[PDB]
């Protein structure tokens, strides 16, 4: 079978924490009073949730209410435990309350008010400095959650809320997040198609925090090259083909061999054989002002097939691409 793998960093964090920390199925939810909150306007609708601008009538504070549909309601304890464990961490969305309809039994998460603007709305208009600045803010959140034994597993522009005027960023939607336990085989049906790192696409289950780093690299590539999404696959199989047309197939087969991954035979007629393309091939007159040797060196060190070979969030924070960021 497949060769085991362990995270290079924060490997045994959860072993050194009590079961109360990571045993979300045993968590006793602290329910607030639903009548403290009133809906103002609908902000959107996820695959398993509904989001609203709302108000806390006990103190007139603006809040965001996320109503969880049955499939998300079933894993609510995991999302709640992760949000409470990470609460107060850098650029982590703050969970303010948890309520439930006494009639329908529908649960809802109440969060700290965040301006209703996602990264995707602006990330295609930013200056070179702003891309570095916001990337660094996302890295602070990822290094924190990874250091706390948690993988986000759904890093993408829509899950990054930015108040551009106040240069403030929050990592949201922890509904797919999980606790990392070394040697654990996880469900590969995580992350959105364009931000799925290769381990998911080849059904390699023993992945870790480095999955979030591949997704972050996909966001960077889209930002610096003005190409949304950067790897534009039509399904999970074609997504791996789009990646192989850039990273090349030689390194893919070396990766599959290293971890003894069984490559689905459907890939036989579609992957083909491709050279590794130089990152400079994506540079053109409309994006050249966002590209630098440091941006390309950094991107090259995130977008690697081998999950252990990718920069960690803290190593990424130390890259020269971020030297101009005011820390």
């Amino acid at each position: 079978g497949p060769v085991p793998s362990r995270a290079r960093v924060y490997t045994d964090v959860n072993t050194h924490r009590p079961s109360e920390y990571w045993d979300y199925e045993s968590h006793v939810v602290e329910w607030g009073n639903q009548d403290d909150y009133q809906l103002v306007r609908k902000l959107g609708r996820g695959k398993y949730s509904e989001v609203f601008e709302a108000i806390n009538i006990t103190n007139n504070e603006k809040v965001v209410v996320k109503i969880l549909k049955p499939v998300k309601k079933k894993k609510i304890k995991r999302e709640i435990k992760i949000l409470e464990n990470l609460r107060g961490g850098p650029n982590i969305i703050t969970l303010a309350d948890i309520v439930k309809d006494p009639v329908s039994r529908t649960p809802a998460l109440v969060f700290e008010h965040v301006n209703n603007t996602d990264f995707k709305q602006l990330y295609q208009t930013l200056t070179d400095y702003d891309i570095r600045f916001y990337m660094y803010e996302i890295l602070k959140a990822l290094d924190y959650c990874h250091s706390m034994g948690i993988m986000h597993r759904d890093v993408k522009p829509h899950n990054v809320m930015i108040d551009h005027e106040h240069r403030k960023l929050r990592l949201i939607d922890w509904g797919l997040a999980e606790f990392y336990h070394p040697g654990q085989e996880y469900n590969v049906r995580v992350a959105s198609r364009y931000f799925k790192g290769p381990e998911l696409l080849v059904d390699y289950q023993m992945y870790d925090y480095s999955l979030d780093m591949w997704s972050l690299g996909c966001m960077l590539a889209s930002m610096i090259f003005r190409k949304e999404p950067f790897f534009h696959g039509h399904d999970n199989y074609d997504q791996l083909v789009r990646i192989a047309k850039v990273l090349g197939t030689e390194d893919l087969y070396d990766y599959i061999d290293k971890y003894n991954i069984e490559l689905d035979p459907r890939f036989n007629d579609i992957l083909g054989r491709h050279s590794r393309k130089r990152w400079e091939r994506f540079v053109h007159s409309e994006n050249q002002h966002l590209v630098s040797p440091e941006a390309l060196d950094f991107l090259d060190k995130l977008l690697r097939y081998d999950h252990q070979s990718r920069l960690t969030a803290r190593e990424a924070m130390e890259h020269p691409y971020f030297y101009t960021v005011v820390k």
């Binding site: 909150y37 009133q38 809906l39 103002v40 509904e50 309809d101 529908t106 809802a108």
Partner: peptide, 13 residues
């Protein structure tokens, strides 16, 4: 008698 998933609404203003 006007609730969405049990929440009342706060419009106008």
């Amino acid at each position: 008698g006007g609730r969405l998933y049990g929440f009342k609404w706060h419009g106008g203003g």
